[PDB]
Amino acid sequence: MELIKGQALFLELDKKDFLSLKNNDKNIPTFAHPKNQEKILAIFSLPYKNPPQNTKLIAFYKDKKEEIFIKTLEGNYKSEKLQVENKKIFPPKTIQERIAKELKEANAIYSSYTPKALFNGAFNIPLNSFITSDFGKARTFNEKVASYHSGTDFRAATGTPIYAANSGVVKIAKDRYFAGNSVVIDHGFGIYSQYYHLSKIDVKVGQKIKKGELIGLSGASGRVSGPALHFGILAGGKQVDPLDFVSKFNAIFQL
Ligand SMILES: [Zn+2]
Numbered sequence: 616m617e618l619i620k621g622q623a624l625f626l627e628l629d630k631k632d633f634l635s636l637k638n639n640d641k642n643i644p645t646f647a648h649p650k651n652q653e654k655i656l657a658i659f660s661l662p663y664k665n666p667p668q669n670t671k672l673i674a675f676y677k678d679k680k681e682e683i684f685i686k687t688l689e690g691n692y693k694s695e696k697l698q699v700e701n702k703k704i705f706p707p708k709t710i711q712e713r714i715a716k717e718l719k720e721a722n723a724i725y726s727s728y729t730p731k732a733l734f735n736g737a738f739n740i741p742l743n744s745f746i747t748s749d750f751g752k753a754r755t756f757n758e759k760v761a762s763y764h765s766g767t768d769f770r771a772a773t774g775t776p777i778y779a780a781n782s783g784v785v786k787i788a789k790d791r792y793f794a795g796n797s798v799v800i801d802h803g804f805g806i807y808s809q810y811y812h813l814s815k816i817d818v819k820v821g822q823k824i825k826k827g828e829l830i831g832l833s834g835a836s837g838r839v840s841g842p843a844l845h846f847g848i849l850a851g852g853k854q855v856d857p858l859d860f861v862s863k864f865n866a867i868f869q870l
Pocket of ligand 1 (some may be wrong): 665764766767768844845846
């Protein structure tokens with residue numbers, strides 16, 4: 616198989632006598648195929664920055680092992696050469712501490728795995744606008760990726776209502792350094808949607824949220840380039856192309 620870096624794919628496997636799916640020593644969770652009672656699914660994601668060239672997963676069955684080869688593709692992302700090498704910025708200690716604390720908190724959430732569906736059918740887009748900055752726009756130095764846009768930006772004047780892309784449980788709902796006013800929702804199966812730079816947060820941590828339910832108002836918090844809605848998806852432990860993921864997810868769980 617082939618998969619572009621920074622995207623997810625849904626792996627389909629036989630359910631009968633399946634024991635475990637592994638990437639080296641890392642276990643990949645499985646969930647039911649909603650349409651084919653003899654299949655299960657798993658989400659495999661490749662990181663945008665510095666992915667392996669190839670991946671081999673082993674599905675262990677009671678009587679066999681089944682290998683799965685995945686070749687990484689570079690894709691056709693927009694990319695611009697950085698010019699200033701000076702990358703190690705030097706923030707004040709008070710900012711370094713906040714950054715480090717919010718990163719620990721987020722990683723604890725994104726590493727967690729809810730082993731049931733909290734979603735309800737297909738994902739919807741969080742507002743009926745248009746993309747002004749695509750996922751995966753990269754800045755490169757040393758023929759390597761120095762940074763990239765880890766979500767997609769929708770056009771939104773400050774104060775535009777933002778709605779949950781799918782049902783789930785709010786896990787983050789506060790102001791964070793790079794994301795500004797942030798909402799993160801657990802949809803189950805390690806799938807999280809992200810709503811950043813809001814001007815107003817209308818949900819609390821732990822709250823159960825319905826698809827299409829108001830979660831806040833867009834803004835420009837934490838954002839230098841003015842008002843927009845940054846929408847992200849984390850799945851398989853990685854930030855992935857959100858509209859690509861939604862398209863792949865909806866093809867399976869639509870009906
Ligand atoms: Zn963005």
